[PDB]
Design a protein around this ligand. Structure first.
Ligand SMILES: *[C@@]([C])([C][O])[C@](*)(=O)[C]([C]C1=[C][C]=[C][C]=[C]1)[N]C(=O)[C]([C]C1=[C][N]C2=C1[C]=[C][C]=[C]2)[N]C(=O)[C]([C])[N]C(=O)C1=C([C])C2=C([C]1)[C]=[C][C]=[C]2
Ligand SMILES: [Mg+2]
Lengths: 240, 244, 222, 233, 235, 211, 231, 195
């Protein structure tokens, strides 16, 4: 079998293949995650270079791993499918062996472990993908939001963004998001998520996707018109 | 040892691109243009054969349009030999699904499977990727008529109208201009041929330089029919639309 | 058809004292109605103040003891010459036995020594690996002859105090090493009389804080 | 799992003051057929060890080759192969015992009963038994098959325990062995008159005697025996 | 290119030496061993204020009597911790006892050089393994990706290591109490850290014979930080 | 053997005998048929002694690793399932094990029966071993949810006594346990010989027996 | 230069540079001395520390009751090779009821090291070993190099500044060989030999490591206050 | 385990399954639920060798749930039944086959029709208006042959089911401790708590 060590250390102590995988994430469309008091919202950019697209059947950016956990990403689209499939299999495997659905922290730790494994296994390259994993643990009303990256490190975030121009939207979130008082309602949480994407997106038409996840496996995706109403209200307040 | 001669096909560039995937796409850009157009009452697949000869046996020839099952077909752009490897895998996958669930395979599931195979060659194994881009035209009872494309990266996307191969930039602009959502198959047939006629590198578009196919609910009652056009039938539709 | 098992007879006895322990066993080795050897040692010093005897099918018994002695050696290598405690040896032996759950070591194993508090300890095993710490245990051919005698004379079972008539039990006073050896010798002398596979010789290994000592006694050779 | 085909019967042995004696007949039986009459079942290993084998002859020939190869392998990169690092009886026995027990544990045994007789470097007598089950034991007298039932009782009258070994000379021990071989010829239906005997002494070394015969046999009393009860003529 | 298990002309494995450079870029971790216990402390180093700092888990329990702190490519430590926990509990299964700290450390270090063309590269993380057993008492070990492990009275790893190690050189003595060690870790962490040390961006932990391995609460550490400030202002 | 376990208002009672047999020979008078997996988890043993000890001690390893990974105690449901999945690996290979996994977790007190076939059942009351029928008779007629800790301990003790008396392959002594939310509590070793005569006199039961 | 990328490549002059680079790792290692008489064999090792807070890296490893070695270079490689020796010593005992000859132990190490010098992908061992032992042909001392070369010697030394101790033993050859039935005097000669390789630092209580094996003496290691006698 | 029944009426599928679990000569449980929800509108009851039944059912459940998540779509009862049949047909020639018989009751939301599939351990699939496994059919099929209509209501289906259980309780030597009854219709799966 092909055993070639592709991910290796350089004289300065860097693993270039893992670092170049982060550059693939930088190229990917922007993804944002914001957790409110009783919910988490996942926002995603859709680049408008591709029109004549069939939005019914085109792979959505946010993916359900289980009925209570979702996963969005930035980076190589094909790579993300492999992580999502593995995550979905592990979620059912956990229910089957332990008789409880996975916690969001556990699912994140598994996906992060897969990414790490691909940084020190022979004949494979790292995943060019960073993920945002969000949801609610079974019988728990505390929101969960985690991030992973090609190296395999993961951590919990009050709010976070990844992908192209993520530096800008992170700048926005750092000054706008208050820890002492997070978005109390769904509206406030979605509004803040849309506002953050409007710093980068371009047009607020079909370029913004929003997915709201609430406790007890209550997950819904907002439509174009529903999002467009947020876009309208934000700019009308801005004209002042 | 052997390491000396390894090209390392599955690595990132400093910019975060996959070298071999990008170079495979460069190969595909020189291949004959293939177009897919989805209408409300069917799908059209049109494709241009590359600089043919008069001594080529056209009626028994197939380099662009292939049948995966009774409901799904593909247009090819790139290395034909590479495409046939994948096509036969897709045909088997469709039959496996039918044997397991006793239902025809949904279009997307077949597309995802093939795209996952392409993905694998970019991440592990140390082998060159498949130099192939597909346009998938198919029907199922969930989403109805569907157009997809996949490329050597293993990434796939859904489309109302799309082109692959040579002159896709020019072709996509022409399709974006004249395409409408309430369009019908007969109109889509005309759009596909008109787009090829303007984007072609050849002097004139003729029947012997084309492969054509439609997927219609224009079959007797609630069912779907695949029509791979014969040379004489391509000649007739070229006269009908007013190109020759 | 090939039968991979056999019966080499023999009988063993382990008794735990207050600050000592004994592991005794006869030295006769047999097949069917023949004597192979009148003196074939069956109880072994395995190091770290632990004695061991695997009674039953001698080939499996020798293999197990050999493997445990090896396990003690590698325990020193891997854990900085740390002394293998009797409880740790017992648990290790369980895993040696259960590694052959589906093709068992056909032996009844007993080990003896001192626990980490300096008190006498005996552990006893079945062929598949169930074990437990005991005060008194006879194993092998004449085990059923000896155990009841030990229940009576070591744990004072069914013995009460005269005058009370069954109301007050005989108190469980501790036994000295000299008293235990008397019970061991009488157990084997009695077993030799009524069991054909028992006889020839008796070898006893006594374990104290000072080390491992041996005592040998002749038995009837018929 | 197999069945033994061509077989060799008893191997008998005993310790004496300065060494050990071992003996075995030269017959290779094929069931009740006394098929092969020139079979050597005592196999010397160096000048300090004799391995006596009973049971399946095809497996004996295999063991014979393992021992021959063992000597070859021990000499490799060994300047002291004919001195301090020569093969000892205890090394040879433990090797065989390891092989026998492994083979029984794979349910494919070498269908034999083996006695390894020899003298160690320090002059100590070595005598140990091993068989198809991997069962091992040592005793002042050892015998396989019928020998265990008939020879041991006679040999144990000479050396009944360990303390009798220094009191037993080579002449007495050889006499006992030769008498035992006669008794086996009288009473073992799978035995022969012709046999081999080996003595390994710590002073005089290895003496290997071939083409020995059972002699001084009593048959004359047979003439007087008539019928099975009431018959007089 | 070149082999992964290649020796340099100086007699060192290139990859092992390069992994050590990655460890120098990692966040600071400090360990101090005393006769009353071993203290482990780490710099969390959050990349952003929105990152919930309590999810940064750079101090980890291996067994009740063994703890562990990490520095470098911390993702690489997860499989090492998993192996350590398995080794610790497996030995308890086989021998009905706690495993020696040295033996646990040796088991972790046996993974180190299992790389070639097994895993494709050495680990890019160093570990401070602290614990207690009956034979050798309170112990602190430094496990490297070279497969080598040294025992230490006190040790610092990470970006501010050589500066911290020089400070530990002067401060450590054989009669240190547990409380004194706690303040000493906090003092040196505060010295080498970029950002100002508080209960949210730094974490303490310890291992004692009685209570075993414990990670300190942010409320408990906050008091020790306040106690440190006052005693430094006292002279 | 005889083992039992039942849930009630104040947790779960666990009672077992201590006899071990090799044919008709009583090999052991006092064998521990309960395993202390952790301060809040217990496991009973019936069937092959070696199988019970090995696999339930291996379960404790796996339950312990759960705590280290998740920083939290494993549920009774999950622990019982790990064990049943172990049994399912050696499917038809000849293992003989019957155990009840007893404990307290976030759902409250938990009780699961698990055997060598892989069967895994949740329930209020279980009894395993050669004498389970005798124990069930006493349990079924005297069980309530509203039992006091003192009365519940006695019920499980008395139910084992019933089996120890009638079943030839049950006896020796009774080992009692009580599981609370603060953990399990050992309630001693009780010799059946002494316990029988005591219960006979105090209760008035076993009238047919002379003493 | 162009021929040092891997172990599978000879240079134009017939040299194996990866093996030579592995040999270099031994020279960087701390000094260790080996010597023997007709009755006993002794190892003396200068242990090295990382700093004042650190412990002193152990240099001597026991392989059997009658055999053991001292290391110089990559310590993990010594652990692998000593583990192999432990197994081989143990195979000889379990199968042949025979203590492994020291000479045969050297032949086995040679062959194990050699395989790593001829195959692609792997690497040579980066450690040197001094093996002592007492077998049926008396006391023995071996020197192992990761090139594969194993040599039987009266005395030797390997590691940094080992040339000084090696010269001393070459002068003392006739004296220390005759030290029969006197373990303390043989150790003294070893301690005096390793002292010729010291600069700046001297032999302290937690610095020095000694091991001995002989006629009626199992392989035992002396560390800590057990070697204060010889300082 | 023993008795599992199934009946397909006008607008729903009803499954009845015994509550008893026996081990040796003792009934360990009299409230056991011999069923698993494979999807919101598909229920599978099971009966066979001890241990194998639950392991197989949960394995099928996991696979269908995995499919549901992957495609964000519920498989038709027909598709699920075919998947289950293949797994059993695969199993029967294995080293150690899974000895499990199942009934799959589902409501097809596309066709707006209830569907009942009977599959035995060999992988023998049949679509039926009513079905059973083991000896259950011997007692009950004569009643079902007589009384069954395809236009029956759910309430009439339950009444005919009661009559079947009464006949079983009268003529079987086996005490199966009553049945748990579950209904599968357009609104999903629910349990009849009083039967
Ligand atoms: C009843 C006593 C059964 O009669 C009960 O189920 C006990 C359970 C038990 C659990 C843990 C520990 C001890 C007992 N079972 C046994 O005692 C079993 C029953 C049994 C015998 N053969 C058999 C059984 C079960 C299934 C298949 C086959 N008895 C044993 O396992 C026998 C083999 N063990 C012993 O006799 C000895 C043990 C254990 C032991 C001995 C003998 C000696 C020293 C230590 C331990
Ligand atoms: Mg007798």
């Amino acid at each position: 079998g092909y055993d070639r060590a592709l991910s290796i250390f350089s004289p300065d102590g860097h693993i270039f293949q893992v670092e170049y995988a982060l550059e693939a994430v930088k190229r990917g469309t922007c993804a944002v995650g914001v957790k409110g008091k009783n919910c988490v919202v996942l926002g995603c950019e859709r680049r408008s270079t591709l029109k004549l697209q069939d939005t019914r059947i085109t792979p959505s950016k946010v993916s359900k791993i289980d009925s209570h956990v979702v996963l969005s990403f930035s980076g190589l689209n094909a790579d993300s499918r492999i992580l999502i499939e593995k995550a979905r299999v592990e979620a059912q495997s956990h229910r089957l062996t332990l008789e409880d659905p996975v916690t969001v922290e556990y699912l994140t730790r598994y996906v992060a472990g897969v990414q790490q494994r691909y940084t020190q296994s022979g004949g494979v390259r790292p995943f060019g993908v960073s993920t945002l994993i969000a949801g609610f643990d079974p019988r728990d009303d505390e929101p969960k939001l985690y991030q992973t990256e090609p190296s395999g490190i993961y951590s919990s975030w009050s709010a976070q963004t990844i992908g192209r121009n993520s530096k800008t939207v992170r700048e926005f979130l750092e000054k706008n998001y208050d820890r002492k008082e997070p978005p109390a309602t769904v509206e406030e949480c979605v509004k803040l998520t849309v506002r953050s994407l409007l710093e980068v997106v371009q047009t607020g038409a079909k370029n913004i996707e929003i997915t709201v996840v609430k406790p007890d496996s209550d997950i819904v995706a907002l439509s174009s018109e529903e999002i467009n109403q947020y876009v309208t209200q934000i700019e009308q307040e801005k004209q002042e | 040892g052997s390491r000396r001669y390894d090209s390392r096909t599955t690595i990132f560039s400093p910019e975060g691109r996959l070298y071999q995937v990008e170079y495979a796409l460069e190969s595909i850009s020189h291949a004959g243009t293939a177009i897919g157009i989805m209408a409300s009452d069917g799908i059209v697949l049109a494709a241009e054969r590359k600089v043919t000869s008069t001594l080529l046996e056209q009626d028994t020839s197939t380099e662009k349009l292939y049948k995966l099952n009774d409901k799904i077909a593909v247009a090819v752009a790139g290395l034909t030999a590479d495409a046939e490897i994948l096509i036969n895998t897709a045909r088997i996958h469709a039959q496996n699904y039918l044997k397991t669930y006793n239902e025809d395979i949904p279009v997307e599931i077949l597309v995802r499977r093939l795209s996952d195979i392409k993905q694998g060659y970019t991440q592990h194994g140390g082998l060159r990727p498949f130099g192939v881009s597909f346009i998938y035209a198919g029907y199922d009872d969930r989403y109805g008529y569907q157009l997809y494309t996949s490329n050597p990266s293993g990434n796939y996307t859904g489309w109302k109208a799309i082109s692959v191969g040579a002159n896709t930039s020019a072709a996509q602009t022409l399709l974006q201009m004249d395409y409408k959502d309430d369009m019908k198959v007969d109109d889509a047939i005309e759009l596909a041929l008109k787009t090829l006629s303007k984007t072609t590198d050849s002097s004139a578009l003729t029947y012997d330089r084309l492969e054509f196919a439609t997927i219609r609910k224009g079959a007797n009652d609630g069912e779907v029919y695949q029509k791979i056009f014969k040379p004489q039938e391509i000649k007739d539709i070229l006269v009908k639309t007013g190109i020759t | 058809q090939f039968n991979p098992y056999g019966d080499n007879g023999g009988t063993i006895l382990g008794i735990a004292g207050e600050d000592f322990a004994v592991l005794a066993g006869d030295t006769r080795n047999i097949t069917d109605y023949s004597i192979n050897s009148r003196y074939e040692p069956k109880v072994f010093d395995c190091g770290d103040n632990i004695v061991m005897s695997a009674n039953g099918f001698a080939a499996d018994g020798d293999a197990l003891v050999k493997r445990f002695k090896n396990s003690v050696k590698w325990y020193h290598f891997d854990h900085n010459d740390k002394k293998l405690s009797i409880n740790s040896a017992a648990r290790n032996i369980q895993h040696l036995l259960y590694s052959r759950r589906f093709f068992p070591y056909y032996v009844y194993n007993i080990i003896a020594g001192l626990d980490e508090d300096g008190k006498g300890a005996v552990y006893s095993f079945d062929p598949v690996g169930s074990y437990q710490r005991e005060q008194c245990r006879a194993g092998g051919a004449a085990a059923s002859l000896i155990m009841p005698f030990l229940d009576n004379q070591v744990n004072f079972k069914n013995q009460y105090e005269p005058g009370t008539n069954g109301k007050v039990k005989k108190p469980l006073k501790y036994l000295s090493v000299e008293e235990v050896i008397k019970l061991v010798r009488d157990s084997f002398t009695s077993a030799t009389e009524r069991h054909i596979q028992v006889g020839d010789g008796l070898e006893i290994l006594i374990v104290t804080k000072d080390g491992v000592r041996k005592e040998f006694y002749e038995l009837k050779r018929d | 799992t197999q069945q033994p085909i061509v077989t060799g019967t008893s191997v008998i042995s005993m310790k004496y003051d300065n060494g050990v004696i071992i003996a075995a007949d030269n017959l290779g039986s094929y069931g009740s057929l006394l098929r092969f009459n020139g079979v050597e079942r005592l196999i010397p290993v160096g000048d300090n060890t004799v391995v006596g084998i009973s049971g399946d002859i095809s497996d004996m020939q295999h063991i014979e080759r393992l021992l021959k190869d063992l000597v070859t392998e021990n000499a490799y990169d060994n300047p002291l192969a004919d001195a301090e690092e020569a093969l000892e009886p205890s090394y040879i026995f433990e090797y065989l015992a390891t092989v026998m027990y492994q083979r029984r544990s794979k349910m494919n045994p070498l269908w034999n009963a083996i006695i390894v007789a020899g003298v160690q470097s320090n002059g100590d007598q070595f005598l140990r038994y091993v068989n198809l089950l991997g069962v091992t034991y040592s005793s002042p007298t050892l015998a396989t098959g019928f020998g265990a039932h008939m020879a041991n009782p006679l040999l144990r009258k000479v050396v009944d325990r360990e303390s009798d070994i220094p009191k037993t000379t080579v002449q007495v021990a050889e006499e006992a062995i030769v008498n035992a071989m006669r008794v086996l010829y009288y009473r073992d239906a799978r035995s022969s008159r012709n046999f081999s005997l080996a003595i390994i002494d710590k002073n005089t070394g290895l003496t290997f005697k071939k083409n020995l015969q059972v002699e001084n046999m009593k048959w004359d009393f047979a003439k007087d025996i008539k019928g099975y009860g009431t018959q007089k003529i | 290119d070149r082999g992964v298990s290649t020796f340099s002309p100086e007699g060192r494995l290139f990859q092992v030496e390069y992994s050590l450079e990655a460890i120098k870029l990692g966040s600071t971790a400090i360990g101090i061993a005393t006769k009353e216990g071993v203290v482990l402390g780490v710099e969390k180093r959050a990349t952003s204020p929105l990152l919930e700092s309590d999810s940064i888990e750079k101090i980890v329990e291996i067994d009740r009597h063994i703890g562990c702190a990490m520095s470098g490519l911390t993702a690489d430590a997860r499989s090492m911790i998993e192996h350590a926990r398995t080794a610790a509990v497996t030995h308890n299964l086989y021998y009905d006892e706690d495993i020696n700290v040295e033996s646990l450390t040796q088991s972790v270090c046996d993974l180190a050089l299992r790389f070639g063309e097994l895993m494709s590269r050495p680990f890019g993380v160093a570990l401070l393994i602290a614990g207690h057993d009956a034979d050798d008492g309170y112990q602190l070990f430094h496990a490297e990706p070279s497969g080598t492990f040294y025992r230490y009275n006190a040790k610092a790893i990470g970006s501010g290591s050589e500066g911290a190690q020089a400070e530990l050189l002067n401060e450590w003595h054989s009669s240190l109490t547990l409380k004194e060690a706690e303040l000493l870790v906090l003092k040196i962490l505060k010295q080498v850290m970029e950002e100002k040390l508080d209960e949210n961006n730094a974490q303490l932990s310890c291992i004692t014979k009685q209570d075993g391995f414990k990670i300190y609460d942010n409320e408990k550490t906050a008091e020790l930080i306040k106690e440190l400030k006052e005693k430094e202002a006292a002279e | 053997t005889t083992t039992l376990a039942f849930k009630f208002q104040h947790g779960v009672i666990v009672a077992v005998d201590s006899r071990a047999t090799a044919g008709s020979y009583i090999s052991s008078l006092r064998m521990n048929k309960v395993i202390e997996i952790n301060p809040y988890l217990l496991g009973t043993m019936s069937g092959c002694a070696a199988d019970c000890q090995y696999w339930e001690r291996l379960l404790a390893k796996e339950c312990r690793l759960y705590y280290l990974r998740n920083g939290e105690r494993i549920s009774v449901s999950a622990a019982s399932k790990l064990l049943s999945n172990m049994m399912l690996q050696y499917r038809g290979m000849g293992l003989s094990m019957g155990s009840m996994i007893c404990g307290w977790d976030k759902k409250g007190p938990g009780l699961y029966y698990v055997d060598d076939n892989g069967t895994r059942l949740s329930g209020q009351m279980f009894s395993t071993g050669s004498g389970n029928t005798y124990a069930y008779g006493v349990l079924d007629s005297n069980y309530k949810w509203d039992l006091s800790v003192e009365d519940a301990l006695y019920l499980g003790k008395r139910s084992i006594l019933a089996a120890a008396h009638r079943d030839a392959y049950s006896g020796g002594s009774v080992n009692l346990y009580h599981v609370t939310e603060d953990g399990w509590i050992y309630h001693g070793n009780h010799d059946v010989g002494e316990l029988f005569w005591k219960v006979k006199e105090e209760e008035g039961s076993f009238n047919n027996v002379i003493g | 230069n162009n021929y040092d990328g891997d172990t599978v490549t000879f240079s134009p002059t017939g040299r194996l540079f990866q093996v030579e680079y592995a040999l270099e790792a031994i020279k960087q290692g701390s000094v260790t001395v080996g010597l023997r008489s007709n009755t006993h064999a002794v190892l003396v090792a200068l242990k090295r520390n990382a700093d004042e807070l650190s412990s002193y890296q152990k240099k001597i490893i026991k392989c059997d009751e009658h055999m053991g070695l001292s290391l110089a270079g990559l310590a993990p490689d010594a652990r692998v090779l000593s583990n192999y020796l432990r197994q081989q010593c143990n195979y000889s005992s379990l199968v042949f009821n025979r203590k492994l000859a020291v000479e045969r132990a050297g032949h086995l190490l040679c062959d194990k090291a050699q395989k790593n010098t001829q195959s692609y992908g792997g690497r040579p061992y980066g450690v040197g070993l001094l093996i002592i032992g007492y077998d049926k042909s008396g006391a023995h001392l071996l020197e192992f190099q990761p090139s594969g070369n194993v040599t039987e010697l009266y005395g030797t030394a390997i590691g940094a500044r080992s040339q000084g101790a090696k010269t001393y033993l070459e002068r003392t050859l006739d004296t220390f060989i005759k030290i029969d039935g006197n373990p303390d005097e043989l150790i003294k000669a070893g301690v005096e030999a390793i002292s010729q390789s010291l600069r700046d630092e001297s032999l302290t209580v937690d610095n020095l490591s000694i091991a001995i094996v002989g006629k009626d003496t199992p392989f035992t290691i002396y560390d800590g206050e057990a070697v204060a006698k010889y300082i | 385990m023993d008795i599992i029944l199934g009946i397909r009426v006008q607008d729903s599928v009803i499954l009845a399954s015994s509550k008893a679990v026996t081990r040796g000569i003792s009934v360990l449980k009299d409230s056991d639920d011999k069923t698993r929800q494979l999807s919101p509108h598909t229920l599978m009851s099971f009966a066979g060798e001890a241990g194998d039944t639950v392991q197989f059912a949960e394995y099928i459940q996991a696979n269908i749930q995995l499919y549901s998540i992957r495609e964000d779509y519920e498989l038709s009862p027909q598709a699920v039944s075919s998947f289950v049949r293949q797994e059993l047909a695969k199993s029967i020639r294995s080293r150690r086959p899974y000895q499990v018989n199942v009934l799959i009751g589902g409501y097809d939301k596309k066709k707006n029709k209830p569907e009942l599939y009977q599959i035995d351990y060999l992988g023998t699939k049949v679509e039926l208006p009513y079905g059973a496994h083991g000896y259950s059919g011997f007692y009950t099929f004569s009643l079902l042959d007589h009384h069954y209509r395809p236009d029956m209501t759910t309430e009439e289906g339950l009444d005919l089911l009661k009559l079947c259980v009464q006949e079983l309780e009268k003529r079987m030597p086996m005490d199966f401790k009553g049945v748990i009854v579950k209904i599968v219709d357009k609104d999903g799966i629910r349990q009849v708590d009083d039967f």
